[PDB]
Design a protein around this ligand. Structure first.
Ligand SMILES: Cc1cn([C@H]2C[C@H](OP(=O)(O)O)[C@@H](COP(=O)(O)O)O2)c(=O)[nH]c1=O
Ligand SMILES: [Ca+2]
Length: 129
């Protein structure tokens, strides 16, 4: 897998963000995660968390997996990095997302995220509290 450049256009919610990628606006859906919706318990806190992480980054990167790069809604499916730190992993590690939507051939970081979920859950964070 390889990191590629992108720039923030706007934070949307916990697990989607609008980025510029190869010079075109795209909504990205974070691979391998699922955040509570805004109206749900922790929904505002998961939006805040992603928004801060992407709005504060000096450098946003996009990393596609080995499988499909866009979902059925036209969202890009990637791992997103903010100053070298994976947003997908960080949400999970903070108990603001669950590992979810694990499809074969787009699952390179599954075990990494599962480990982070186990630590969040051990720490009773947020959705595990
Ligand atoms: C994360 C992800 C979601 N999706 C689709 C499946 C779900 O379909 P349905 O809309 O039919 O439920 C939806 C979940 O996204 P949200 O959690 O953003 O709603 O996005 C993929 O197809 N591939 C993926 O890797
Ligand atoms: Ca969601």
């Amino acid at each position: 897998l390889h990191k590629e450049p992108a720039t923030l256009i706007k934070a949307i919610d916990g697990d989607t963000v609008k980025l510029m990628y190869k010079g075109q606006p795209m909504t990205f859906r974070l691979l391998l995660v699922d955040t509570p919706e805004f109206n749900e318990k922790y929904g505002p806190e998961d939006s805040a968390f992603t928004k801060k992480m992407v709005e504060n980054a000096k450098k946003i990167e996009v990393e596609f997996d080995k499988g499909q790069r866009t979902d059925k809604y036209g969202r890009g499916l990637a791992y997103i990095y903010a100053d070298g730190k994976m947003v997908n992993e960080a949400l999970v590690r903070q108990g603001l997302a669950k590992v979810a939507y694990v499809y074969k051939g787009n699952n390179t970081h599954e075990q990494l995220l599962r480990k982070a979920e186990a630590q969040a859950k051990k720490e009773k964070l947020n959705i595990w509290s």
